[PDB]
């Protein structure tokens, strides 16, 4: 990445930052029990609030049965067809059966407990975790229930509680993201799902794990329970991976507004220079937390442009003021002073910009007071290299992003081609 010699074109590289990837996962098994346990007589409203839940899970036991494609009757030694997006999806689900005899052993126990979260486990690292439905607040309403004196007029507080909880449910269950599951119980993933190297977390790491996709693998109607196999990540600080955000401004050419159409982000990884689609990664203070390696190679032009030789960059034509005309590059200010008024020091001292130059760099304290179409500021430092004026940057590659213009232009290219052969 070459940041200098690039501001003079309207490409404004921004904020070198690190990169982290979730290349491997440490799976667990969440076992939600959607019924609370009451520790005194009966709550007369339990049956009715139970009946409300019967509408949801009864849809789910055939939401899985009759949906499984039986991609793996072979067990990790009439499949028809299935892709790697499912191979890894169900091979990880193949591991559920070997733990099915294990998870079921807990399901026989959590049924009779009165505790919100239990992290019972077998292996040294892996641990299954049991989460009850509203047992957190149940202990905070059965304790007042001694004051309210009743299965109801007391269980009414439970009655509204589960209905509200039911109102919370069916929202993300109506591919679930981990945020919803934590949302029901007001808890957070660093309290229940953190062990060994999967324990020390940042604040940005916390949100990335909550953004991963959680899979449902089993529903038992009798227990009203749902089995969730999460994939907790291990984020290694991938080396030599800098992700520079890129912005563009209206590089003027002969009173017409043009800009260089770079992608949302660009990376440098050794020789790799192609951009990225960071629509999925959680941004950190000094790094990017990506599930995969989002890097996709750019064109030769947009990769030769970002290593300099700006005499290769694509040159789109501006339509609608989505691209800016002025931005604060370092302490100083860079602007397209032909279209927007810059004026330097004196508010009335509207500075002329030559018609053959795109953006005029205002830095090195030539204008200690700068007013962009109004307003006032004070440049500091490092926005230029001694008012660095480059050569006549002649941009050749003018590209249009609408398919109509491309089609129309080649129609002319097709038409004269027929005329050209004679």
């Amino acid at each position: 990445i070459d940041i200098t010699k690039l501001q003079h074109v309207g490409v404004l590289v921004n904020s070198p930052k690190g990169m982290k990837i979730s290349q491997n996962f440490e799976t667990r098994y969440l076992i939600l029990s959607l019924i609370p346990k009451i520790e005194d007589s009966n709550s007369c409203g339990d049956q009715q609030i139970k009946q409300y839940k019967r509408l949801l899970d009864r849809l789910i036991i055939p939401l899985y049965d009759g949906l499984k494609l039986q991609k793996d009757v072979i067990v990790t030694n009439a499949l028809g067809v299935a892709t790697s997006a499912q191979i890894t999806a169900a091979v990880a689900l193949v591991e559920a059966k070997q733990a099915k005899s294990d998870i079921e052993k807990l399901k026989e126990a959590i049924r009779d407990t009165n505790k919100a979260v239990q992290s019972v486990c077998s292996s040294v690292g892996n641990c299954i975790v049991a989460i009850k439905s509203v047992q957190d607040y149940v202990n905070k309403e059965i304790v007042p229930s001694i004051a309210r004196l009743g299965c109801e007029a007391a269980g009414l507080q439970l009655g509204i509680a589960l209905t509200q909880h039911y109102s919370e449910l069916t929202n993300c269950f109506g591919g679930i993201k981990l945020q919803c599951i934590a949302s029901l119980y007001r808890t957070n993933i660093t309290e229940i799902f953190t062990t060994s190297t999967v324990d020390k977390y940042d604040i940005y790491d916390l949100l990335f794990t909550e953004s991963i996709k959680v899979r449902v693998i089993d529903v038992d109607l009798n227990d009203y329970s749902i089995t969730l196999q999460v994939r907790l990540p291990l984020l290694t600080r991938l080396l030599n991976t800098q992700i520079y955000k890129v912005d563009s401004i209206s590089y003027n050419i002969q009173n017409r507004e043009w800009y260089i159409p770079l992608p949302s982000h660009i990376m440098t990884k050794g020789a790799f220079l192609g951009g990225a689609d960071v629509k999925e990664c959680i941004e950190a203070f000094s790094s990017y937390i990506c599930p995969s390696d989002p890097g996709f190679v750019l064109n030769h032009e947009m990769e030769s442009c970002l290593s300099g030789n700006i005499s290769q960059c694509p040159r789109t034509t501006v339509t609608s003021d989505i691209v800016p005309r002025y931005a604060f590059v370092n302490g100083g200010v860079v602007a397209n002073c032909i279209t927007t008024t810059c004026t330097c020091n004196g508010i009335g001292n509207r500075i002329n910009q030559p018609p053959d130059q795109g953006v005029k760099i205002i830095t090195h304290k030539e204008c200690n007071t700068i007013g962009i179409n109004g307003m006032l500021f004070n440049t500091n430092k490092e926005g230029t290299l001694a008012f660095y004026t480059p050569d006549d940057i002649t941009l050749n590659n003018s590209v249009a992003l609408d398919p109509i213009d491309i089609s129309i232009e080649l129609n002319k290219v097709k038409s004269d081609l027929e005329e050209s052969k004679e």
Epitope: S101, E104, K105, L106, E108, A109, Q118, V120, S122, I128
Partner: antibody, heavy 125, light 103 residues
Framework: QLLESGGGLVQPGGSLRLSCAAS????????MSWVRQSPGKGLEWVAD????????NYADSVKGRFTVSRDNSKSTLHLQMKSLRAEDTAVYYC?????????????????????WGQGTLVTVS | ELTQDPAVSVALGQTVRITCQGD??????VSWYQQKPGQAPLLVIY???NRPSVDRFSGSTSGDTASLTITGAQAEDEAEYYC???????????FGGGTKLTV
């Protein structure tokens, strides 16, 4: 905690029913387990029971020929014996798993047998 | 099944180590058992912790082997050690041959 009842004298191909009562012990809240010890050898694995009757796990000669029954009402653990032949002459201890409802952290481990009862005698003539 | 040393003997003191190795214990805890000959066995080490009745010995789990290390010798320890583990699948339990010990 004390757990043993004893009583057994049979003939090859016969039947028997061992039992053990866990006095001063939360029988329903805690799992159960039996272990066989040949007189000339070490210990070995026979049958497992959960806190409830939901899961019965057996390894009787690595197959199914015995049935062990749990009863929470009288807090006794019963194992049904039948068709003994050349492989069962040993002593039997009634055992209780360490884990349970109050402390489920070790529920997934069925070999953490906390306290063992006195050995009972069986014979294959 | 997991195995161990058939037997071992020492003098009346110093310290003693008991080994254990097999196709298991790589990702599973260990449960060392002693029984005085003619009596029901007792648990000494469940997981990495120790039973309070036992302090005197705690053992050490390794990557592929288990090891229970004990020190001293008294009117105790004249009995063999059984090294046990949870089954690979989670259904059975496995027991090794007793390592007869004399002070």
């Amino acid at each position: 905690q004390l757990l043993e009842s004893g009583g057994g004298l049979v003939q090859p191909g016969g039947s028997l029913r061992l039992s053990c009562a866990a006095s001063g012990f939360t029988f329903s809240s805690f799992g159960m387990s039996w272990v066989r010890q040949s007189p000339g050898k070490g210990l070995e694995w026979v049958a497992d029971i959960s806190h409830s009757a939901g899961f019965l796990n057996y390894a009787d000669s690595v197959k199914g020929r015995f049935t062990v029954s749990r009863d929470n009402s009288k807090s006794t653990l019963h194992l049904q014996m039948k068709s003994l032949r050349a492989e069962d002459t040993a002593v039997y201890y009634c055992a209780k798993r360490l884990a349970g409802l109050p402390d489920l952290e070790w529920l997934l481990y069925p070999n953490f047998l906390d306290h063992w009862g006195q050995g009972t005698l069986v014979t294959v003539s | 099944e997991l195995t161990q040393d058939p037997a071992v003997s020492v003098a009346l003191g110093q310290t003693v180590r008991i080994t254990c190795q097999g196709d298991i214990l790589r990702t599973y805890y260990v449960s060392w058992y002693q029984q005085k000959p003619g009596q029901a066995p007792l648990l000494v080490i469940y997981g990495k912790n120790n039973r309070p009745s036992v302090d005197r010995f705690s053992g050490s789990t390794s990557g592929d082997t288990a090891s229970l290390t004990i020190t001293g010798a008294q009117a105790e320890d004249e009995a063999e050690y059984y090294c046990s583990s949870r089954d690979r699948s989670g259904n059975h339990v496995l027991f090794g041959g007793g390592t007869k010990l004399t002070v």
